[model samples]
Target chain A: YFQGHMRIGIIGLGRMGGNIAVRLTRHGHDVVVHDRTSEVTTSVVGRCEAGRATPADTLADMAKLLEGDEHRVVWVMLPAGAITEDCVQQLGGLLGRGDIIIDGGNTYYKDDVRRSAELAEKGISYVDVGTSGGVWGLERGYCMMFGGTKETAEYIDPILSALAPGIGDVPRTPGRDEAGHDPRAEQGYLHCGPAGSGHFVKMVHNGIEYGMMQAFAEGFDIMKSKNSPILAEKDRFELNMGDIAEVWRRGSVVSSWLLDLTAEALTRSGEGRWTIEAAIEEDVPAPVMTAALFTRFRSRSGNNFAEKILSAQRFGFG
Target chain B: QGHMRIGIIGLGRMGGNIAVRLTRHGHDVVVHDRTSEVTTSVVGRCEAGRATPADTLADMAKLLEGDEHRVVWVMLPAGAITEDCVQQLGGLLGRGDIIIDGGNTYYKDDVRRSAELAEKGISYVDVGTSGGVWGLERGYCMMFGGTKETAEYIDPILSALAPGIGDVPRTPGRDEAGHDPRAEQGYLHCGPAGSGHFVKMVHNGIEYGMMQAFAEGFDIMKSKNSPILAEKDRFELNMGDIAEVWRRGSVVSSWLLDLTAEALTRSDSGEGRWTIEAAIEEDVPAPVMTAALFTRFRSRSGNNFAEKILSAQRFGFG
Candidate 1:
């Protein structure tokens, strides 16, 4: 259902944001791009479909670039927390009634729910976009989860379509689409619900992701210890992890976008506590997610004095 | 490129489907099962000229006499049944014969079995086959461990059985100059005996973690409307839409998610258990895997023993 493009203002020209800017421009969207780094914005302009990209010196200048539009659409792709909040607040000041501001970051759902109300009072629309594609989104396009009012989401539907990884080779899920409600899911973006819903789902998605990655981490740990003294020499193994990963990539049930890239396999620490905290608030036993999060904490050597104390106590008891 | 005389024992789920599929690819399949009825049924299901029903294990061995080397693939439940079958086949099959275990046999068993079969000049190949009932059409994901020569000998069968490269587009920056491209196909020769099952064990372990991740998130959502939750916290969410929304364009969209959306459950019994044991032996902190394994058992055991104990402790404290 989402097709065509429009004059849209995009803030935060970093990794995912930069690629998304380029992708939207290529798809014939008149994109006004701005970044904290002027050089990055200049670089993005150079990569866009010729004459389609407009560089904005500031957020106000970006807003002015789309001044002629009936309804201004500004998509914020900045870092979450205060930066995102400050920018959205600034955009709310700039834009008038019926204008849309899309939060395209990993902002907390509560933030979306909370910020959306403040914007709503000023007749400004808010869109919480949980965008996933990471650095590879430029070529592959992004998987978007949009949380906002039905009207605002529909208003900015073209932007969602342009940035989304349009249903490609991956076949449609069976026994789904029987209702034919909205095929936007197959298109790789969905207006999940009113404000805050999209990010909640994405938050849960991240939690599951943590658990899945930790599951893999634990498995590889087991295989790596194939030479453990507990096992006989016959049971010991010298596994080639790279080979194992690549093979599993294509044919196995575990084969996925996460499993598709070795670059995707390894990453940063402690990033999955949101899901755990949510599970606890929601009154659910999220042992898998919790374990995965705790495992990541242990991966770092930041504060193992606690672990040392455990050993110390054990020695004394013995 | 694919035709070969293959003897397969056990015409159950994977075994029966594999026989039909291999026959379709022009292999002469000599089939055997514990029950004579299934053996006859499987033979009838295969191409008319390509199937031969073997009444017994010895009969199957005799049927493959004219083949360049007799290869008997066992696809049965893991443990005593599979072990006893392999040991008996070792006695019947002599030099140059190959016994391929295509079930979830423990990697340790494969290593010891490989060593035992080696003395008789019989090579043992462990093919950790993934793709359950759906594999009949989708093709099996096979990770095999065997001597180079033995694994190479079965390439034709592996090639025929795998999903092949069409399921997913070729990955970026990958070329087969240094290694066999069969992994891109649904099958991969992981390493020497036991490596295939080991990788498969990890695959299943990861599978459990992924499953639990989806389950926990969905459960949290399902309970959002619970009476105990605060008014602001309660979300009247249509879970069906939430699942379908995620099915496309989300990070967590996966084979497991698709299965979960359809209210699906796969038989994941031994792999998780074995993975837990491996982690313990390795002294690795496998909280996610251990939780996933225990969760499965806890679901089946249907317990509130710990809860009762906690209640008793609370009463005692009171």
Candidate 2:
């Protein structure tokens, strides 16, 4: 058992969860961590710095670790859907009234609203957090948007603040500009509103992200299109995509955290698809985001347009 | 003769607004348009004290040619009209005069025009202007790309055009909140010749994508069939409210996002489509932007899926 600034328990020490735990400890917050896999828990515990980390092999053990703590704060970071829902339910049984449960996975906002209602029945507070910054969050700090009651939001501020890159960190130490531009208090984290708002805001963030990525990918692709006479023979447009991205980062109106991500390497997440599906259900127009989601599908499909056409032609002629 | 800083061609909405902003800042402007009514309206509305309307391009050019400097800015529609104006002005303007193409001309066109003008010892500046109609009061976001000497000459005009620190919303991501140099004038000297319009094109492309993404998100929330919401539980969303919520502290908080919160009918100009076409010519992958443009087309065309299915069926069955 180790001690430091704030004491909290984290469940499911997978990539995002483990990194968050380590980051909290590095920022001087004592974290009680649990994972089904002992090795994962141990791996995180081994990496803590100023604040200490203690591993609990079971949810019961983790609850005990958080038992007498002033607020009894517990953060669940399991995968979204069944696993996360099950963990929240099991935790509800172990935790008492006035305790807090934070769901930091990419769960649906409506689901978060339902879980909050369920938890509220027993007088437990629930916070649904939408977190961005991915694997790099540990160093860059996460962009955290959380939704809960005002009181719960106030109580959780310290934890969230420590996890976000504050405005003080921008133009961050020269070499870190690309990774650290958005890790600030007002810019990076906020209490968006009531129970489901955080994830909803995050849902839109991912939707915009998909659009941005697809735009960048298509712009670069057009630059390289063999069909374009301009790029092929006339003067040759052998542009460096990275260089163009870098230029946009400096002072362009379109400069953003997502653009920074593209400048480095294209990274994909699941929220875009959910956002698009949600749009279709709502009958709202979301052409860019939907196209981005479909582009991803196109990228991975085996029997694509060209191959299908070829097969059809061979079958018909023969 | 009355003193004037520059001559402006084409007194349209964008040009007219810019003239008012500059005139209010005490800069003298001589304006011209093919349609005298538009030019007269601008002169009357902007107050003829600091602004004057000319009937011919040569008269406007003569008004701009002071002993120390000569600068003429054209805000005409891009393509043949712009080309004819530039050519006519080239014949009338003296050596060392500067010509600025402020329309949404293609980046390659800027390159071609820059080369053509350079042969005659005249400087050409390409500016990609943003801020739309609100630019008169809110100040324009100007992306300017040209030679260093020309940029320096244009700096004073840009200073008057760009939004100052006082005009900024005092957002945390801004320099006052420590994001480093983000607090300067809204105008930026992006690069040389084609670079300004290139960044602007990409900016419009990104705008299309963001707009489409937001539209999709709103549509999802409105859909009764949404998986996240039951039919009985489904409520009509005040999309304006959702957009307003995202504007504060959310990761997607941006100028475009702020515009969405206003809930105005969306409109499209040629830039978004041109950006996509350029992407195709260059072989750059820009699916989201393409989708955004296609979405606009779909809005105008009545349901076309049947056409696709019938074409495929005809090819196979016949």
Candidate 3:
């Protein structure tokens, strides 16, 4: 079990950071805020029952209030580019030995490893958390991958708890009746590994996501194909990707949190047309997710001379 | 001439073994490859197996105690490399020569090769070879893609490679489709041109899905509320158990699961975890292999272009 009472400081309140901050606050964790600009963290500061904000003249000022020597845990919820580097650098310079830093952003796994070592020398621990719930994080809870020293991670138990959806989120009464209501809350999240492991796991998670979206997109194409009787009733052709995504979530192999979100977006945006021909012409590698979707495109088109040509790029034929 | 003496170019792992199988069955065989060392090794092995080889296709043709219509099987890498082999072999040999291209080639190219070879009165038959490194002992899974006439000439080799009801008692073992469950499976003579590779590609696609199924099943095992976790300790936190159950008539059953089961049972101190996490680390897109890929990408990256970034962003909220 993780130690240290979970009081997480959320720095840089953007879409992800703000959503995560609100979720933690709603779940009753003491949250401290620091951002490049006060404009972003304002809403989150207002939400936190026990919240504090600081205009950082220097890294020490912010670190002194937040990074206490006893069980020090600070979550840098910043963007993944140069900003993330700056945040980690400041944290390392300011925090004393043994303070844990969780970079809960979509940073590459390699960065986590590099940052982990750099911070380790300063006696400050770093955890690269590849966080996954987007706009819906406050409701569904964000999927997170944390990689760092196991000992440092053990200190942030409360943070993991408040941010993750409760265990009851998984074993629900099977239906779309409440398809959402925070699947993360009941099911909880996975503590994938140590030092860059989180981001690595998260990266593959994205690949599978591509295939899933492609698969869903393919299903729509199938329904909309020239020979498909489903499209005979053009009026009923309104049944698009969003409907398929939602339907699959009800009961299908590909049903997932991503699917849920895509379905929601589809419901709002309606079905958009996609073509494998265009993808291939552009020379997209697409991997499996997009590849699978391309396969579907070939399947529905029935005459896939070009699609086959594209597939040929990976392995030589004849 | 009704009877055909076959010449095979490139007697590496596949070609050499194929020659041996043919020669043992009383078919005249010639094998050629680029390397003299490879030629010596294959010749040594085949001679030990009581088979003879000739230095050239024409020499083998002269040595053949059979009819004039010669069938040549080409086993080499696909694309331009294979085209060069076909051209060189075709030029050296005379008209009425039938060349079978058996390698994992693209189907589109297969169609073109078949046409080009036909113009020279040197028929090209496209074949899809599977079974990986185990083809030597277990026999290869050969999918044929060519005309019926060319297929007839190569039927013997096809039969030898395709799976059959092995010599075993029905009650003690199992029937063809029923008993062994695997022996009944055979390499289909897929119709015309690119059909073999086309079907093989689909098979690979299915393989991708199957791998993903096992990987996802393992991922689910890590989930706290997975029903299969009831068998956790009995199976020792085994993702393989779910794989085993799936193989035995779960809607998600496939050969991939069978292979995964074999891989799963192979462990020393119970520390064999092969999830998509490892695949992601290795930069494999995996899709059906790695569901998390697209999930993370869509969730975290949003409009971010690459699929990997999307994959890295997914996880359960809890």
Candidate 4:
């Protein structure tokens, strides 16, 4: 007798993550939130859970919240680097065979493959979910790319449906969570392919993100180059990051979430104040980013050999 | 005020010239080779050409200031020769001296050696040098891998060695350009030790794949009903249409095309089709690059037994 109910585990309750937990809980899923900080855990529990099923204090406690106790689902939403590695290793130890583990992080694709194979050995299914919602994820549902066994995905489908931002989900309960109202199945979250395919696509997405961002940066530089001409036409006009982003957003091919983020950052940081240094401290091989910077590096050195060295290190001053 | 001393091993051509390059940069350069003739020849050439030569690593060490560093630059084929050279040098070379590998070793191995040498305070740099055998006369495109300080120590010499790519050259004369090796210094401290080798490895992979694509495209065109199709065709096929048009305005215009043009112009056999066919047989990831190769294979497998097999052609040849 399968008493199917959507019991969801959310690990890591940072800014974007907390929004995800809130969105999931509001849809009446039995949301078990986990955060390293007890403050984040307790506060998100009180606010997100509609004052019914609060956050679980530990993995053991979260496991108890699953419906009629069979295959459990835990979503690990953590930082993509070493922290995620450590957490996955530890989580694998705790989870049983047939348990569902979702890595919802910006993890490297190779890491996803390695983790997937490791988990598959123990009959523990692993799905990589590339979460692409930033701070605005609560309102604008995350663009999620996932990978795993199609059959295994069925068990965890309800959680994604609930957490994802959508309205008028009138689907009947496969069963029932602690809170009522059947969770709507997810959209936009595709079962990309086997092993690392989901993360591979996501990494490519990030690479594209870097390229697009650089293209935008170069366009800004082009605009700045024509600043004097524009100034002459307008008498006394100054171009700011927000102004540039807004104008581009109207009809621009390069406009995306990065543009929106850039606009917000500029509005907060002011004119020529926010630099690539603030974006990325070190020269992130970010092949795409480097390509753009190199273009800018070339542009600044135009007809002026002596001033090129000056342009090389002139970050914020632009 | 103090001169840096460097001992270079494997003085065949690039090795022999590297010694001279350092010597000309005002560093005391000692030379070694698998064949003693190369050492004698390089030292002889250094004296005859630039009045620059030092005989041994120990002798080179003595040429440095008390606080100044002694650097050993090894230029040999990777694998066993490289391992033996570094191991042999490690015994004679003291702590705090840096070892720079100016050959294409696997990046993973470079990382291992870098770690191995670090215990003795011997710094290691894996450098990926371009410009082939002409490095002696034309300078080299030197992309290096090492820590910041190690790179800094070798900067004087790297500056002398790097060549100009698209970027303008800072140093005068090609020979003196020898003194400013890191010029385009498109050179980067890839990561830890193996980064340079890793980058070079990936570079080669891309180069091979790109070459295959061009080769395959040429075969496809040759297979067409064109003048360059039969054995009587002695001229190189005009990629002129595909390449020239793309060169003028297309997303595919790249440095690879420039290199492809070089091969197209210089190919003596006028048999571009066969070259691509060979690549596919090698079973390289040729991906979509094997179209020409497949066509060639199809041509070969067309008789008796092959014809019977070809009847099941839905997937066989393809």
TM-score of each: 0.90, 0.70, 0.43, 0.40
Ranking of all predicted structures according to DockQ, beginning with the best and ending with the worst: 1, 2, 3, 4
Q: Candidate 4, residues A141-216: lDDT per residue as tens digits? A: 6555566787876666766655444432312222223333222212334455565555544443343343444444
DockQ of each: 0.51, 0.18, 0.02, 0.01
lDDT of 3 by residue, A1-318 (tens): 433345566677887777777777677666677677766656567765554333333346557666544656777877677988988887888777867888887676657878888888887788877565557557755555556665766566567756654443122222312323222222344455556666654554444444444544433343334123433332121223332333233222333444445545655500011212212323333344444554434454655866777889777696
Candidate 1 chain B, which ten residues in sequence have the lowest lDDT sum? B262-271
- Candidate 4 per-residue lDDT, tens place, B63-163, comes to 54266677778888767888887886666667888888877676657878888989888888988665556555656655456787888777777766644
**Residue lDDT tens for model 2, A123-213:** 9999999887778778777878778998988787778888876653232122222433222233457676688777876787778766766
lDDT of 3 by residue, B200-251 (tens): 5433333344344335434423442334334321112323333332232122
- Native contacts recovered, each model: 0.56, 0.31, 0.02, 0.00
Q: Which stretches of candidate 4 lie over 4 Å from their true place?
A: A1-5, A51-53, A67-69, A165-186, A228-247, A251-290, A293-318, B1-318
Quick one: best TM-score, which candidate? 1
Total clashing residue pairs per candidate?
0, 29, 48, 12
C-alpha RMSD values across all candidates = 3.6, 8.4, 20.6, 27.7
Over the stretch A1-318, how does candidate 1's per-residue lDDT look in tens digits? 645568988899988888888898888898899999999999999989899999999888987888988799888888787898899989998888978988888888888888889999998988888877677677877877778888777778887887888877776666666655567776778777788877777777777777777777777677677767777775677675656666776556786656765423421032368777766777889888888777656544555867777888888655
Evaluating just chain A, the predictions reach TM-scores of 0.89, 0.82, 0.71, 0.71
Higher-DockQ candidate among 2 and 3?
A: 2
Indicate which candidate wins on lDDT: 1
For residue A164, what is the lDDT in candidate 4?
Answer: 46
